[PDB]
Amino acid sequence: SSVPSQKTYQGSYGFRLGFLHSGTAKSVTCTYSPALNKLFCQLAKTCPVQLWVDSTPPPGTRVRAMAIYKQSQHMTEVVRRCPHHERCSDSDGLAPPQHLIRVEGNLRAEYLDDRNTFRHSVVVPCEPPEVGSDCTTIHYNYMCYSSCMGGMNRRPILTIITLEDSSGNLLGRDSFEVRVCACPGRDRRTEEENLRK
């Protein structure tokens, strides 16, 4: 399959992501490394991702998430759930069981199987922040481990977040690496130490 672009693009509205500062304690379930541009999270746990813009986008703007493999020798392979997890009937009623990325708690989430690339994505309406908040947060879930045999099988992935107009045209783009693992705090600490070395 052809490879969706991962080029960072703020666009007319100044679109970019933001992440909480959750730390690296052994008990943490989701933590983001700015130095690695990498999110570490446990299986199927809530991953808050912030959306930031400098100016107000039009009604009908949407926000899409898609995963691709990071390594060039694997980027043409569709990222999907492994043969076990696609069959474990953990459906939320909306997400197809094959999809790695879900949006949590948004009844207007839509899930796409691309008719030409066969790639999976989940898209929601772009919404302004809640009254009293400075940004909008989407809660994502990753539904396989990076290590799952027959699926990602230890290959690193990226999530690409695109801001789109109502036709699906590109307005903005950002991305981050993801590792779905049992101990995100320890793994973030290890990889940041490896980077320092």
Ligand X SMILES: CCn1c2ccc(CNC)cc2c2ccc(-c3cscn3)cc21
The site for ligand X (CB under 6 A) is made up of 51-53, 56-57, 59, 61, 126-129, 134-136
Residue 179 binding: pick among ligand X, Zn ion, none (C-beta 5-8 Å cut-off by kind): none
Least CB distance to ligand X at residue 182 (A): 32
For residue 162, give the nearest of 107, 105, 135, 124 by alpha carbon. 124
Least CB distance to ligand X at residue 131 (A): 12
DSSP symbols for the chain: --------B-TTTT-EEE-------TT-SEEEETTTTEEEE-TT--EEEEEE-SSPPPTT-EEEEEEEESSTTTTTSPP---TTGGGS----SSS-TT-SEEESS-TT-EEEE-TTT--EEEEEE--PPPTT-SSEEEEEEE-S-TT-TTTTTT--EEEEEEEE-TT--EEEEEEEEEEE-S-HHHHHHHHHHHHH-
Cβ-based nearer residue to Zn ion, 32 or 145: 145
Residue 144 binding: pick among Zn ion, ligand X, none (C-beta 5-8 Å cut-off by kind): Zn ion
Least CB distance to Zn ion at residue 154 (A): 12
Residue 181 binding: pick among Zn ion, ligand X, none (C-beta 5-8 Å cut-off by kind): none
* Residue 148 assigned ligand-binding role: yes
Cβ-based nearer residue to ligand X, 134 or 193: 134
Least CB distance to ligand X at residue 150 (A): 36
Residue 56 binding: pick among Zn ion, ligand X, none (C-beta 5-8 Å cut-off by kind): ligand X
Cβ-based nearer residue to Zn ion, 30 or 148: 148
Q: How far is it, in rounded angstroms, from Cα 156 to Cα 49?
A: 19
Cβ-based nearer residue to ligand X, 126 or 178: 126
Residue 59 binding: pick among ligand X, Zn ion, none (C-beta 5-8 Å cut-off by kind): ligand X
Indicate the pairing of strand 157-164 with strand 170-180: antiparallel
Binding residues: 82, 85, 144, 148
* Binding site members for Zn(2+): 82, 85, 144, 148
